[PDB]
Amino acid sequence: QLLYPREEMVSLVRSLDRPQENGLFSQDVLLQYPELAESYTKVCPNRCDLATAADRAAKGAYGYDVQLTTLKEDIRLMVNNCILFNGAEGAYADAARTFEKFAMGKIDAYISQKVG
Numbered sequence: 001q002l003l004y005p006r007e008e009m010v011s012l013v014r015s016l017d018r019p020q021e022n023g024l025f026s027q028d029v030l031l032q033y034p035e036l037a038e039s040y041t042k043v044c045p046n047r048c049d050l051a052t053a054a055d056r057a058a059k060g061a062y063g064y065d066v067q068l069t070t071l072k073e074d075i076r077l078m079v080n081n082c083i084l085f086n087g088a089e090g091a092y093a094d095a096a097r098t099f100e101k102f103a104m105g106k107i108d109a110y111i112s113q114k115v116g
């Protein structure tokens with residue numbers, strides 16, 4: 001059954017792309033940095049970005065999980081790749097962890113709104 005309409009899901013995912021992250025998760029790593037084709041995919045054989053997630057949202061990929069698990073998995077993959085590739089103690093990892101707490105807050109606020 002369809003729980004979350006495509007147009008709400010597109011709006012939710014677009015809302016996660018904010019200026020505070022200075023484009024860190026806006027787009028596919030390889031599209032932006034083609035020199036990383038072999039280096040990135042060796043460390044991160046599975047990847048995602050907020051433009052890809054918005055495309056997935058628009059195609060209804062996220063509408064069928066009560067807890068939006070499929071979307072949350074695409075956010076965790078972005079965040080976990082950023083931390084693994086740049087190193088867990090560095091500034092890119094800090095930026096990832098701050099992004100993740102915000103993104104998860106925003107996703108949970110939307111689920112609350114849909115029940116109330």
Ligand SMILES: CCCOc1ccc(CCc2nc3cc(-c4c(C)noc4C)ccc3n2CCN2CCOCC2)cc1
Nearest residue numbers: 021022023024025026029032033081082085086091092095
């Ligand atoms: C303060 C700690 C974080 O440091 C930052 C320092 C700089 C930036 C902006 C530049 C920048 N460095 C990026 C790194 C990745 C990347 C890599 C490599 N491995 O994992 C990830 C994730 C992705 C996007 C990035 N972008 C954005 C590029 N858009 C800029 C605007 O026009 C389109 C391209 C962002 C954050």
